Amino acid sequence: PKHEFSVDMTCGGCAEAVSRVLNKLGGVKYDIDLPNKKVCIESEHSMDTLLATLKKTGKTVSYLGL
Ligand SMILES: [Pt+2]
């Protein structure tokens, strides 16, 4: 499935932090829209796991749906 999340990223370092947590999780194809504070993830990970992973950055995260 393809999931979209809102992630409260401020700048380049925030975009890097999101990339780092997702790279560590593995098994993800993602793209990060820093200006619009959005992250899109194609994966067979559960939405739960992806939400928990993004939250490791400490940024506010919510789910924008499939
Ligand atoms: Pt930042």
Side-chain angles (χ1 to χ4, degrees):
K2 280 175 187 145
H3 297 284
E4 188 173 30
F5 292 88
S6 170
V7 184
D8 187 24
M9 297 169 290
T10 291
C11 48
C14 302
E16 293 184 20
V18 170
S19 173
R20 286 191 198 90
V21 300
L22 295 174
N23 286 171
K24 178 66 183 180
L25 177 65
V28 289
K29 180 177 159 179
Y30 60 88
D31 86 277
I32 293 160
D33 181 348
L34 172 60
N36 293 314
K37 293 180 176 177
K38 285 174 181 183
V39 184
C40 180
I41 304 167
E42 187 164 12
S43 183
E44 292 288 358
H45 283 285
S46 66
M47 172 275 176
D48 316 68
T49 291
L50 296 175
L51 176 67
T53 300
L54 291 167
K55 285 185 177 216
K56 288 176 174 189
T57 65
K59 311 310 172 198
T60 298
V61 179
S62 56
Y63 183 52
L64 303 179
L66 286 162

Tab-separated table of all heavy atoms in Angstrom:
chain	number	residue	atom	x	y	z
A	1	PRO	N	0.829	-1.211	0.000
A	1	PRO	CA	0.000	0.000	0.000
A	1	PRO	C	0.859	1.255	0.000
A	1	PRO	O	2.043	1.196	0.347
A	1	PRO	CB	-0.759	-0.100	1.322
A	1	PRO	CG	-0.843	-1.572	1.580
A	1	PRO	CD	0.427	-2.158	1.050
A	2	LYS	N	0.251	2.370	-0.381
A	2	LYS	CA	0.912	3.667	-0.376
A	2	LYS	C	0.242	4.530	0.681
A	2	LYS	O	-0.957	4.808	0.593
A	2	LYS	CB	0.790	4.357	-1.739
A	2	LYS	CG	1.769	3.871	-2.811
A	2	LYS	CD	1.463	4.537	-4.155
A	2	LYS	CE	2.308	3.949	-5.278
A	2	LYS	NZ	1.562	3.884	-6.572
A	3	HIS	N	1.010	4.908	1.694
A	3	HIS	CA	0.517	5.703	2.833
A	3	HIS	C	1.087	7.113	2.803
A	3	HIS	O	2.265	7.290	2.492
A	3	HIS	CB	0.977	5.055	4.128
A	3	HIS	CG	0.420	3.688	4.352
A	3	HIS	ND1	-0.881	3.477	4.750
A	3	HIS	CD2	0.992	2.463	4.255
A	3	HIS	CE1	-1.088	2.179	4.887
A	3	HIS	NE2	0.032	1.543	4.589
A	4	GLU	N	0.267	8.109	3.135
A	4	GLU	CA	0.742	9.472	3.272
A	4	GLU	C	0.659	9.925	4.721
A	4	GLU	O	-0.341	9.658	5.420
A	4	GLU	CB	-0.026	10.442	2.369
A	4	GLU	CG	0.616	11.839	2.389
A	4	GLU	CD	0.021	12.833	1.400
A	4	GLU	OE1	-1.181	12.731	1.075
A	4	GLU	OE2	0.765	13.746	0.962
A	5	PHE	N	1.715	10.607	5.169
A	5	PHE	CA	1.777	11.142	6.523
A	5	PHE	C	2.083	12.634	6.516
A	5	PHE	O	2.795	13.132	5.628
A	5	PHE	CB	2.886	10.444	7.314
A	5	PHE	CG	2.601	8.999	7.605
A	5	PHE	CD1	2.968	8.002	6.701
A	5	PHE	CD2	1.953	8.637	8.787
A	5	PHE	CE1	2.687	6.651	6.994
A	5	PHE	CE2	1.687	7.311	9.074
A	5	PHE	CZ	2.048	6.316	8.157
A	6	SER	N	1.546	13.346	7.505
A	6	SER	CA	1.970	14.713	7.801
A	6	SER	C	3.075	14.592	8.842
A	6	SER	O	2.894	13.902	9.837
A	6	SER	CB	0.788	15.507	8.385
A	6	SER	OG	1.195	16.755	8.895
A	7	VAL	N	4.222	15.232	8.610
A	7	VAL	CA	5.346	15.178	9.556
A	7	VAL	C	5.877	16.590	9.715
A	7	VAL	O	6.215	17.227	8.725
A	7	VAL	CB	6.483	14.251	9.067
A	7	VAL	CG1	7.581	14.156	10.123
A	7	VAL	CG2	5.954	12.861	8.742
A	8	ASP	N	5.961	17.067	10.957
A	8	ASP	CA	6.308	18.465	11.223
A	8	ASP	C	7.798	18.733	11.073
A	8	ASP	O	8.514	18.921	12.069
A	8	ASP	CB	5.845	18.857	12.634
A	8	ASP	CG	6.023	20.348	12.919
A	8	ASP	OD1	6.068	21.167	11.972
A	8	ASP	OD2	6.105	20.702	14.117
A	9	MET	N	8.255	18.734	9.824
A	9	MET	CA	9.657	18.964	9.497
A	9	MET	C	9.878	20.444	9.306
A	9	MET	O	9.113	21.109	8.602
A	9	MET	CB	10.031	18.244	8.198
A	9	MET	CG	9.922	16.737	8.267
A	9	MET	SD	10.072	15.987	6.635
A	9	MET	CE	8.551	16.475	5.858
A	10	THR	N	10.941	20.950	9.915
A	10	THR	CA	11.303	22.333	9.731
A	10	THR	C	12.283	22.532	8.575
A	10	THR	O	11.977	23.271	7.640
A	10	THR	CB	11.767	22.963	11.060
A	10	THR	OG1	10.629	23.069	11.934
A	10	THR	CG2	12.333	24.362	10.826
A	11	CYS	N	13.442	21.884	8.618
A	11	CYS	CA	14.394	22.127	7.537
A	11	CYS	C	15.121	20.872	7.019
A	11	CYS	O	14.642	19.735	7.199
A	11	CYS	CB	15.359	23.237	7.966
A	11	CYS	SG	16.053	22.985	9.613
A	12	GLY	N	16.262	21.072	6.364
A	12	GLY	CA	17.031	19.952	5.801
A	12	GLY	C	17.345	18.856	6.802
A	12	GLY	O	17.196	17.674	6.501
A	13	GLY	N	17.763	19.234	8.011
A	13	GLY	CA	18.057	18.258	9.041
A	13	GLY	C	16.849	17.422	9.446
A	13	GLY	O	17.009	16.263	9.809
A	14	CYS	N	15.652	18.014	9.385
A	14	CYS	CA	14.419	17.287	9.700
A	14	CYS	C	14.117	16.284	8.599
A	14	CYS	O	13.710	15.163	8.902
A	14	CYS	CB	13.219	18.205	9.872
A	14	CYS	SG	13.448	19.485	11.202
A	15	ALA	N	14.285	16.699	7.339
A	15	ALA	CA	14.102	15.780	6.199
A	15	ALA	C	15.105	14.617	6.284
A	15	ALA	O	14.737	13.447	6.074
A	15	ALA	CB	14.232	16.532	4.861
A	16	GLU	N	16.359	14.926	6.619
A	16	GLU	CA	17.361	13.884	6.859
A	16	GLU	C	16.971	12.936	7.982
A	16	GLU	O	17.212	11.729	7.874
A	16	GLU	CB	18.748	14.482	7.135
A	16	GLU	CG	19.364	15.182	5.928
A	16	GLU	CD	20.770	15.693	6.188
A	16	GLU	OE1	21.424	15.198	7.135
A	16	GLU	OE2	21.224	16.572	5.427
A	17	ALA	N	16.399	13.472	9.073
A	17	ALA	CA	16.018	12.624	10.208
A	17	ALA	C	14.949	11.635	9.792
A	17	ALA	O	15.022	10.457	10.147
A	17	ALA	CB	15.552	13.453	11.396
A	18	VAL	N	13.972	12.101	9.030
A	18	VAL	CA	12.928	11.199	8.490
A	18	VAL	C	13.555	10.118	7.605
A	18	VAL	O	13.237	8.931	7.716
A	18	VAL	CB	11.835	12.001	7.723
A	18	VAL	CG1	10.883	11.069	6.943
A	18	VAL	CG2	11.043	12.876	8.701
A	19	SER	N	14.456	10.525	6.723
A	19	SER	CA	15.105	9.558	5.853
A	19	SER	C	15.880	8.528	6.663
A	19	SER	O	15.809	7.344	6.375
A	19	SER	CB	16.046	10.272	4.897
A	19	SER	OG	16.795	9.328	4.168
A	20	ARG	N	16.582	8.975	7.698
A	20	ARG	CA	17.374	8.060	8.534
A	20	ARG	C	16.514	7.006	9.224
A	20	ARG	O	16.868	5.829	9.207
A	20	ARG	CB	18.202	8.825	9.583
A	20	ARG	CG	19.398	9.549	9.003
A	20	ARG	CD	20.319	10.064	10.114
A	20	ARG	NE	21.206	11.105	9.599
A	20	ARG	CZ	20.910	12.408	9.606
A	20	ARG	NH1	19.754	12.831	10.107
A	20	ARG	NH2	21.764	13.295	9.108
A	21	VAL	N	15.394	7.411	9.822
A	21	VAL	CA	14.546	6.423	10.518
A	21	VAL	C	13.924	5.427	9.545
A	21	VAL	O	13.817	4.239	9.852
A	21	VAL	CB	13.483	7.053	11.480
A	21	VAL	CG1	14.184	7.876	12.562
A	21	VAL	CG2	12.444	7.887	10.752
A	22	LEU	N	13.549	5.907	8.363
A	22	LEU	CA	12.973	5.022	7.355
A	22	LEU	C	14.017	4.079	6.763
A	22	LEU	O	13.725	2.906	6.543
A	22	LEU	CB	12.253	5.820	6.261
A	22	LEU	CG	11.019	6.591	6.731
A	22	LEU	CD1	10.504	7.449	5.587
A	22	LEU	CD2	9.916	5.683	7.281
A	23	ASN	N	15.223	4.585	6.517
A	23	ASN	CA	16.326	3.741	6.025
A	23	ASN	C	16.633	2.634	7.028
A	23	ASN	O	16.882	1.482	6.643
A	23	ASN	CB	17.594	4.573	5.777
A	23	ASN	CG	17.508	5.450	4.533
A	23	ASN	OD1	18.393	6.290	4.303
A	23	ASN	ND2	16.475	5.260	3.726
A	24	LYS	N	16.632	2.983	8.315
A	24	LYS	CA	16.907	1.981	9.361
A	24	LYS	C	15.823	0.907	9.435
A	24	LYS	O	16.104	-0.291	9.608
A	24	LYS	CB	17.073	2.662	10.719
A	24	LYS	CG	17.311	1.716	11.893
A	24	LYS	CD	18.640	0.990	11.806
A	24	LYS	CE	18.780	-0.004	12.963
A	24	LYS	NZ	20.078	-0.730	12.911
A	25	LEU	N	14.570	1.325	9.305
A	25	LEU	CA	13.471	0.368	9.273
A	25	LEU	C	13.622	-0.608	8.099
A	25	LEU	O	13.465	-1.825	8.269
A	25	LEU	CB	12.130	1.111	9.185
A	25	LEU	CG	10.882	0.213	9.075
A	25	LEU	CD1	10.677	-0.616	10.325
A	25	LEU	CD2	9.657	1.062	8.778
A	26	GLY	N	13.923	-0.065	6.920
A	26	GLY	CA	14.055	-0.850	5.697
A	26	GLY	C	12.730	-1.225	5.068
A	26	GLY	O	11.678	-1.049	5.657
A	27	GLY	N	12.791	-1.734	3.839
A	27	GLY	CA	11.607	-2.226	3.153
A	27	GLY	C	10.602	-1.129	2.861
A	27	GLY	O	9.397	-1.340	2.959
A	28	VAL	N	11.130	0.051	2.542
A	28	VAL	CA	10.285	1.214	2.228
A	28	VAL	C	10.742	1.927	0.958
A	28	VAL	O	11.946	2.032	0.673
A	28	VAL	CB	10.266	2.243	3.396
A	28	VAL	CG1	9.481	1.701	4.591
A	28	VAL	CG2	11.683	2.645	3.794
A	29	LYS	N	9.769	2.428	0.202
A	29	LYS	CA	10.034	3.303	-0.911
A	29	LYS	C	9.340	4.601	-0.533
A	29	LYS	O	8.116	4.636	-0.465
A	29	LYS	CB	9.404	2.710	-2.170
A	29	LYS	CG	9.612	3.528	-3.403
A	29	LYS	CD	9.007	2.825	-4.625
A	29	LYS	CE	8.748	3.818	-5.756
A	29	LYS	NZ	8.168	3.150	-6.968
A	30	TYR	N	10.101	5.665	-0.301
A	30	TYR	CA	9.481	6.888	0.212
A	30	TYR	C	9.872	8.143	-0.553
A	30	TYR	O	10.887	8.198	-1.261
A	30	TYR	CB	9.792	7.085	1.707
A	30	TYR	CG	11.273	7.198	2.019
A	30	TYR	CD1	11.927	8.443	1.983
A	30	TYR	CD2	12.027	6.069	2.341
A	30	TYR	CE1	13.302	8.542	2.252
A	30	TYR	CE2	13.382	6.166	2.621
A	30	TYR	CZ	14.013	7.409	2.576
A	30	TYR	OH	15.365	7.501	2.836
A	31	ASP	N	9.047	9.168	-0.406
A	31	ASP	CA	9.478	10.455	-0.864
A	31	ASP	C	9.008	11.530	0.109
A	31	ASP	O	7.902	11.470	0.667
A	31	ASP	CB	9.063	10.686	-2.304
A	31	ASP	CG	7.722	11.231	-2.418
A	31	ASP	OD1	6.773	10.425	-2.379
A	31	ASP	OD2	7.616	12.483	-2.526
A	32	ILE	N	9.901	12.485	0.328
A	32	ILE	CA	9.738	13.483	1.371
A	32	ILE	C	9.525	14.840	0.709
A	32	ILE	O	10.349	15.270	-0.111
A	32	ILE	CB	10.993	13.499	2.275
A	32	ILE	CG1	11.110	12.193	3.074
A	32	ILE	CG2	10.974	14.719	3.224
A	32	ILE	CD1	12.534	11.908	3.608
A	33	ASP	N	8.405	15.489	1.056
A	33	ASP	CA	8.078	16.829	0.578
A	33	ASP	C	8.255	17.779	1.749
A	33	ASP	O	7.341	17.981	2.559
A	33	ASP	CB	6.640	16.865	0.043
A	33	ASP	CG	6.236	18.234	-0.496
A	33	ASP	OD1	6.957	19.230	-0.264
A	33	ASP	OD2	5.163	18.315	-1.129
A	34	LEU	N	9.455	18.339	1.863
A	34	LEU	CA	9.796	19.175	3.004
A	34	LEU	C	8.930	20.448	3.101
A	34	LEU	O	8.383	20.738	4.182
A	34	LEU	CB	11.298	19.510	3.001
A	34	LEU	CG	11.776	20.545	4.032
A	34	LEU	CD1	11.495	20.099	5.462
A	34	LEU	CD2	13.275	20.814	3.835
A	35	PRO	N	8.802	21.204	1.993
A	35	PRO	CA	7.961	22.405	2.025
A	35	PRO	C	6.547	22.181	2.548
A	35	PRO	O	6.038	23.018	3.314
A	35	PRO	CB	7.934	22.843	0.557
A	35	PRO	CG	9.255	22.412	0.039
A	35	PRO	CD	9.491	21.072	0.694
A	36	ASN	N	5.929	21.065	2.156
A	36	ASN	CA	4.536	20.781	2.493
A	36	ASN	C	4.366	19.872	3.704
A	36	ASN	O	3.236	19.536	4.073
A	36	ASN	CB	3.799	20.227	1.270
A	36	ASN	CG	3.659	21.259	0.167
A	36	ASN	OD1	3.281	22.413	0.425
A	36	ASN	ND2	3.959	20.859	-1.062
A	37	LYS	N	5.489	19.520	4.338
A	37	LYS	CA	5.509	18.731	5.571
A	37	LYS	C	4.785	17.399	5.382
A	37	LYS	O	3.929	17.000	6.183
A	37	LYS	CB	4.938	19.538	6.749
A	37	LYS	CG	5.797	20.736	7.147
A	37	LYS	CD	5.164	21.452	8.310
A	37	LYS	CE	6.039	22.583	8.782
A	37	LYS	NZ	5.308	23.290	9.877
A	38	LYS	N	5.114	16.729	4.281
A	38	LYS	CA	4.458	15.462	3.951
A	38	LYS	C	5.492	14.408	3.602
A	38	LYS	O	6.556	14.723	3.053
A	38	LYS	CB	3.472	15.649	2.793
A	38	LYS	CG	2.175	16.368	3.210
A	38	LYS	CD	1.315	16.665	2.008
A	38	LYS	CE	0.042	17.389	2.418
A	38	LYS	NZ	-0.832	17.624	1.239
A	39	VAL	N	5.173	13.161	3.939
A	39	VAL	CA	6.016	12.021	3.597
A	39	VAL	C	5.098	10.932	3.041
A	39	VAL	O	4.073	10.609	3.646
A	39	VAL	CB	6.814	11.489	4.819
A	39	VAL	CG1	7.732	10.372	4.378
A	39	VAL	CG2	7.633	12.632	5.492
A	40	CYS	N	5.449	10.399	1.875
A	40	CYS	CA	4.668	9.348	1.242
A	40	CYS	C	5.489	8.061	1.249
A	40	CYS	O	6.647	8.092	0.869
A	40	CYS	CB	4.351	9.745	-0.195
A	40	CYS	SG	3.399	8.539	-1.050
A	41	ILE	N	4.883	6.943	1.665
A	41	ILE	CA	5.634	5.701	1.853
A	41	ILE	C	4.904	4.543	1.203
A	41	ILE	O	3.753	4.288	1.538
A	41	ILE	CB	5.854	5.367	3.356
A	41	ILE	CG1	6.547	6.538	4.064
A	41	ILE	CG2	6.681	4.065	3.525
A	41	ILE	CD1	6.520	6.434	5.584
A	42	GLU	N	5.567	3.862	0.271
A	42	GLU	CA	5.055	2.597	-0.255
A	42	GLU	C	5.794	1.460	0.429
A	42	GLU	O	7.029	1.431	0.421
A	42	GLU	CB	5.254	2.532	-1.760
A	42	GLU	CG	4.600	1.310	-2.395
A	42	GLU	CD	4.461	1.434	-3.902
A	42	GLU	OE1	5.067	2.352	-4.499
A	42	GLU	OE2	3.728	0.600	-4.489
A	43	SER	N	5.033	0.531	1.010
A	43	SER	CA	5.610	-0.509	1.872
A	43	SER	C	4.598	-1.591	2.135
A	43	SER	O	3.394	-1.345	2.034
A	43	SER	CB	5.901	0.124	3.238
A	43	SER	OG	6.510	-0.790	4.095
A	44	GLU	N	5.087	-2.765	2.552
A	44	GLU	CA	4.212	-3.756	3.164
A	44	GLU	C	4.312	-3.722	4.692
A	44	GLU	O	3.804	-4.610	5.368
A	44	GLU	CB	4.475	-5.178	2.640
A	44	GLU	CG	4.099	-5.385	1.183
A	44	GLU	CD	2.594	-5.422	0.934
A	44	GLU	OE1	1.792	-5.318	1.888
A	44	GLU	OE2	2.218	-5.573	-0.247
A	45	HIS	N	4.950	-2.696	5.245
A	45	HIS	CA	4.871	-2.470	6.687
A	45	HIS	C	3.467	-2.018	7.032
A	45	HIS	O	2.793	-1.406	6.200
A	45	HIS	CB	5.836	-1.369	7.125
A	45	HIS	CG	7.261	-1.814	7.199
A	45	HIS	ND1	7.728	-2.609	8.218
A	45	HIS	CD2	8.319	-1.586	6.382
A	45	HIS	CE1	9.013	-2.847	8.038
A	45	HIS	NE2	9.391	-2.256	6.922
A	46	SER	N	3.027	-2.316	8.252
A	46	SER	CA	1.737	-1.816	8.721
A	46	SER	C	1.778	-0.304	8.851
A	46	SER	O	2.836	0.287	9.079
A	46	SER	CB	1.373	-2.426	10.071
A	46	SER	OG	2.267	-1.986	11.084
A	47	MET	N	0.619	0.328	8.733
A	47	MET	CA	0.521	1.754	9.028
A	47	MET	C	1.045	2.051	10.438
A	47	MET	O	1.734	3.057	10.638
A	47	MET	CB	-0.930	2.242	8.821
A	47	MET	CG	-1.206	3.671	9.279
A	47	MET	SD	-1.590	3.743	11.027
A	47	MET	CE	-1.731	5.515	11.241
A	48	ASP	N	0.746	1.158	11.394
A	48	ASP	CA	1.195	1.278	12.797
A	48	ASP	C	2.706	1.412	12.903
A	48	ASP	O	3.212	2.268	13.639
A	48	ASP	CB	0.863	0.024	13.623
A	48	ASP	CG	-0.511	-0.502	13.390
A	48	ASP	OD1	-0.781	-0.986	12.289
A	48	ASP	OD2	-1.317	-0.458	14.344
A	49	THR	N	3.409	0.511	12.218
A	49	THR	CA	4.857	0.467	12.257
A	49	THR	C	5.402	1.737	11.628
A	49	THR	O	6.337	2.339	12.161
A	49	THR	CB	5.409	-0.777	11.536
A	49	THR	OG1	5.073	-1.923	12.313
A	49	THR	CG2	6.945	-0.718	11.399
A	50	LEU	N	4.813	2.160	10.507
A	50	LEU	CA	5.323	3.356	9.852
A	50	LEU	C	5.129	4.573	10.752
A	50	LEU	O	6.030	5.409	10.864
A	50	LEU	CB	4.659	3.587	8.489
A	50	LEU	CG	4.932	2.502	7.434
A	50	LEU	CD1	4.119	2.783	6.170
A	50	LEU	CD2	6.411	2.359	7.099
A	51	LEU	N	3.959	4.674	11.390
A	51	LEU	CA	3.678	5.789	12.297
A	51	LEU	C	4.693	5.804	13.441
A	51	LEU	O	5.295	6.838	13.729
A	51	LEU	CB	2.237	5.698	12.827
A	51	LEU	CG	1.820	6.735	13.850
A	51	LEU	CD1	1.788	8.108	13.205
A	51	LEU	CD2	0.454	6.378	14.410
A	52	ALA	N	4.917	4.648	14.062
A	52	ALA	CA	5.881	4.557	15.161
A	52	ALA	C	7.295	4.949	14.725
A	52	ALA	O	8.011	5.639	15.453
A	52	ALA	CB	5.868	3.161	15.760
A	53	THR	N	7.680	4.514	13.529
A	53	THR	CA	9.001	4.825	12.968
A	53	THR	C	9.164	6.336	12.754
A	53	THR	O	10.175	6.917	13.154
A	53	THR	CB	9.239	4.021	11.668
A	53	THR	OG1	9.177	2.622	11.964
A	53	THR	CG2	10.607	4.317	11.040
A	54	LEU	N	8.167	6.977	12.141
A	54	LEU	CA	8.257	8.410	11.892
A	54	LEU	C	8.341	9.179	13.194
A	54	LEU	O	9.082	10.165	13.292
A	54	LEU	CB	7.083	8.906	11.033
A	54	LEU	CG	7.137	8.387	9.586
A	54	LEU	CD1	5.818	8.642	8.906
A	54	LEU	CD2	8.286	9.015	8.793
A	55	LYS	N	7.592	8.719	14.188
A	55	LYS	CA	7.585	9.372	15.506
A	55	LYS	C	8.941	9.323	16.223
A	55	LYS	O	9.175	10.135	17.125
A	55	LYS	CB	6.462	8.800	16.388
A	55	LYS	CG	5.096	9.322	15.968
A	55	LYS	CD	3.970	8.881	16.876
A	55	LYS	CE	2.678	9.531	16.385
A	55	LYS	NZ	1.746	9.919	17.482
A	56	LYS	N	9.829	8.415	15.814
A	56	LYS	CA	11.189	8.326	16.389
A	56	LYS	C	12.001	9.586	16.147
A	56	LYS	O	12.945	9.856	16.897
A	56	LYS	CB	11.948	7.100	15.866
A	56	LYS	CG	11.431	5.798	16.435
A	56	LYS	CD	12.123	4.611	15.848
A	56	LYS	CE	11.635	3.373	16.580
A	56	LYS	NZ	12.412	2.173	16.231
A	57	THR	N	11.632	10.359	15.122
A	57	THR	CA	12.253	11.656	14.844
A	57	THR	C	11.909	12.707	15.900
A	57	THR	O	12.556	13.762	15.961
A	57	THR	CB	11.811	12.261	13.481
A	57	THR	OG1	10.408	12.569	13.490
A	57	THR	CG2	12.141	11.314	12.317
A	58	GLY	N	10.858	12.440	16.665
A	58	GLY	CA	10.319	13.393	17.627
A	58	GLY	C	9.369	14.430	17.058
A	58	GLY	O	8.756	15.186	17.821
A	59	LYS	N	9.234	14.482	15.727
A	59	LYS	CA	8.324	15.426	15.082
A	59	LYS	C	6.887	14.952	15.238
A	59	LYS	O	6.626	13.753	15.326
A	59	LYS	CB	8.647	15.584	13.588
A	59	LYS	CG	10.121	15.851	13.239
A	59	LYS	CD	10.747	16.980	14.036
A	59	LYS	CE	12.255	17.028	13.751
A	59	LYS	NZ	12.997	17.812	14.800
A	60	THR	N	5.962	15.899	15.280
A	60	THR	CA	4.537	15.607	15.291
A	60	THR	C	4.171	14.897	13.979
A	60	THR	O	4.514	15.370	12.897
A	60	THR	CB	3.732	16.907	15.432
A	60	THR	OG1	4.076	17.508	16.686
A	60	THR	CG2	2.236	16.626	15.415
A	61	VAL	N	3.491	13.759	14.095
A	61	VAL	CA	3.112	12.964	12.917
A	61	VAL	C	1.621	12.660	12.934
A	61	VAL	O	1.072	12.282	13.971
A	61	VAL	CB	3.888	11.633	12.867
A	61	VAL	CG1	3.454	10.794	11.626
A	61	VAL	CG2	5.398	11.892	12.840
A	62	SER	N	0.959	12.808	11.795
A	62	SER	CA	-0.388	12.273	11.683
A	62	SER	C	-0.581	11.591	10.339
A	62	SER	O	0.268	11.682	9.453
A	62	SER	CB	-1.458	13.338	11.930
A	62	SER	OG	-1.304	14.418	11.062
A	63	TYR	N	-1.697	10.903	10.199
A	63	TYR	CA	-1.907	10.068	9.026
A	63	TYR	C	-2.861	10.744	8.060
A	63	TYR	O	-3.963	11.135	8.438
A	63	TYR	CB	-2.458	8.715	9.468
A	63	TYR	CG	-2.670	7.694	8.380
A	63	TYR	CD1	-1.646	7.365	7.478
A	63	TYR	CD2	-3.880	6.992	8.308
A	63	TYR	CE1	-1.841	6.362	6.510
A	63	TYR	CE2	-4.080	6.005	7.360
A	63	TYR	CZ	-3.056	5.703	6.466
A	63	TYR	OH	-3.247	4.732	5.532
A	64	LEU	N	-2.427	10.882	6.809
A	64	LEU	CA	-3.239	11.522	5.771
A	64	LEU	C	-3.945	10.502	4.883
A	64	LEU	O	-4.669	10.862	3.955
A	64	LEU	CB	-2.390	12.490	4.924
A	64	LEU	CG	-1.687	13.600	5.718
A	64	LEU	CD1	-0.865	14.481	4.778
A	64	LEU	CD2	-2.674	14.438	6.499
A	65	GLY	N	-3.716	9.229	5.153
A	65	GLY	CA	-4.473	8.161	4.500
A	65	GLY	C	-3.755	7.405	3.399
A	65	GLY	O	-2.578	7.643	3.108
A	66	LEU	N	-4.494	6.487	2.783
A	66	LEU	CA	-4.035	5.706	1.656
A	66	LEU	C	-4.059	6.527	0.370
A	66	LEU	O	-4.935	7.389	0.207
A	66	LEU	CB	-4.942	4.488	1.501
A	66	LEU	CG	-4.768	3.361	2.522
A	66	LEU	CD1	-6.007	2.466	2.503
A	66	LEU	CD2	-3.503	2.549	2.257
B	1	PT	PT	14.674	21.348	10.449
